[PDB]
Each structure stands twice: as C-alpha cells, then as structure tokens.
Design a protein around this ligand. Structure first.
Ligand SMILES: CS(=O)(=O)c1ccc(Nc2nc(N[C@H]3CCCC[C@@H]3N)nc3cc[nH]c(=O)c23)cc1
Length: 263
C-alpha cells in the first residue's frame, strides 16, 4: 500500500538509513520507523516490502506501507527499545526467565514464518527488536524468500554479503536455505541472548568457524544459562539438516520450559 507523504513527519536525526517519524492516521498519530533508500537496489526494498505485506503476526515487525517521494521509503511500526543484543548488553540485570520469554516469542514468530513458507536468511539477535522488555519482534526481511509451493528450500547463487556466523553448514556448502537453516540461526541467536549480546565466535574468520563446526565443535554454555536452554541450542546446531528440528518442535520445547518456569 502506498502512503501519503504529507501525512509523514520525519525526525532530522537517524537511528542507523533508518529514521523515526510519525504517520497521521485518522485521529491518532502513529510513531513509525522509516527505511529510506539512498538515491536494482530499489527492487530489493520492494522485495522486502512484498514479504512484510504478506506477514501478520504479533512477533514480526509490521509494515505500514511504502512512500514514494524524493527518496523511496519503507514505513514500519516502531520498536522503541531497539535491537535485542544491544539491549541485553546494556541491561545485564535482565533475568533468565525474561530471556526465555523473549526467545520463546522469537520462536513463535519463526514458527509462523515456517508455516507461511518464508525463509528469513538473516536471523540474529541484531534483527530482533524490543517493543518492551517483555515483547520481541523479528525484523529485517531484506534477505527473506518466499518458498515455492513445491519446495522446502531456496537455492542462492554466490551471494557474499553473508552473516556466516549465523549460517548452517548446508548454506555454506550447498547454498541451500530452509526453515531448518533458520533454526540453526535461531540457536546462534539463543546463545547471543543468554550471553547478554556478546558476538558469537569472537575473533574468528568465517573459514575458521566453518572448520570449527566441521570438527563437531560448538560454542559453550553461557554463564547462568539453564542447561535445558543450552541443550536446545545444541539441538539447533544439528549438522544434518534432516535430523535438525523445525520451529514447531523448537517453539514447543521453549513453550513448555517457559511455563515450567512460570509454574
Ligand atoms: C537507537 S537504538 O539502537 O536504541 C534503536 C535502533 C533501531 C530501532 N528500530 C529499528 N531499526 C531498524 N534497523 C536497524 C537499525 C540499526 C541497528 C539494527 C537494526 N536492525 N529497523 C527497524 C524496522 C522497523 N521498526 C524499527 O523500530 C526498526 C530502534 C532503536
């Protein structure tokens, strides 16, 4: 849906280009985050908007619309607390239960994405945004693909701006991206979250990570991380795609554990 520029006010400062603004609705004004294109790069923004327009889930960032003026602009709902990794780095008092809660929410959004036959392809703590300390949304659908009705993976060709530390072995070895490869990414994300925003595989190059993983080595259990959560991380890092769980199983595992903690 195309938006009316004269109903949009932008802040002069930027968030990272992404800027805060306000979109006049009928009686209220909605605070928005606006991705603005520095003037086939057009087509990628449109691809991203095309994916977000098909998704409707509480744990996924909503698109408001696109506004063509001066620059091209993708207008989305605002998650005020920002990226998960940054938040947790600055808020080390956040408790295990809370982290469980937030990663469970991520798993619910990913369960839905899996059901909708979309692959995210850039799932990481940086692409989970906090509306509140108890409400997480998945963002950044720029690399995301809608799977064909007759296939369970997307085959890339030699993209190189790849977040290798979040990628499953089959992505690196065969360029095959599935909901199962997103599950691998989710394991890395979980590690990141329980590590309060630390980068994974610190100081390592991509090739060294691939080598570490091929030896069967995996990142260790974060300090204070419940062992059941580390076990779930290790399960996400199943080398063999076919044996690695889907998000239905991952979400169910987190759901039960979370409500075991709540009980
Ligand atoms: C100043 S801060 O670090 O606390 C902060 C950073 C980003 C945001 N919000 C967003 N960021 C981004 N994109 C980037 C910005 C740079 C860091 C990684 C994010 N994925 N995309 C979107 C999309 C829709 N809605 C959003 O709110 C949004 C909010 C606060």
């Amino acid at each position: 849906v195309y938006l009316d520029r004269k109903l949009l006010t932008l802040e002069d400062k930027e968030l990272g280009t992404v800027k805060k603004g306000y979109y006049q609705m009928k009686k209220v004004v909605k605070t928005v985050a606006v991705k603005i294109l520095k003037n086939a790069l057009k087509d990628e923004l449109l691809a991203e908007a095309n994916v977000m327009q098909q998704l409707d889930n509480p744990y996924i960032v909503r698109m408001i619309g696109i506004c063509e003026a001066e620059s091209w602009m993708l207008v989305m709902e605002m998650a005020e607390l920002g990226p998960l990794n940054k938040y947790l780095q600055q808020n080390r008092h956040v408790k295990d239960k809370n982290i469980i809660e937030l990663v469970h929410q991520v798993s619910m959004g990913m369960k839905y994405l899996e059901e909708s036959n979309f692959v995210h392809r850039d799932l990481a703590a940086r692409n989970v945004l906090l509306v509140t300390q108890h409400y997480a949304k998945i963002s950044d659908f720029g690399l995301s693909k809608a799977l064909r009705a007759d296939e369970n993976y997307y085959k890339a060709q030699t993209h190189g701006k790849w977040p290798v530390k979040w990628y499953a072995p089959e992505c690196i070895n065969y360029y095959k991206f599935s909901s199962k490869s997103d599950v691998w990414s989710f394991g890395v994300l979980m590690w990141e979250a329980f590590s309060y925003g630390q980068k994974p595989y610190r100081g390592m190059k991509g090739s060294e990570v691939t080598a570490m993983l091929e030896k069967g080595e995996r990142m260790g259990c974060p300090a204070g991380c419940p062992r059941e959560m580390y076990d779930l991380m290790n399960l996400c890092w199943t080398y063999d795609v076919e044996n690695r769980p889907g998000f239905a199983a991952v979400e169910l595992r987190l759901r039960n554990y979370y409500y075991d903690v709540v009980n």
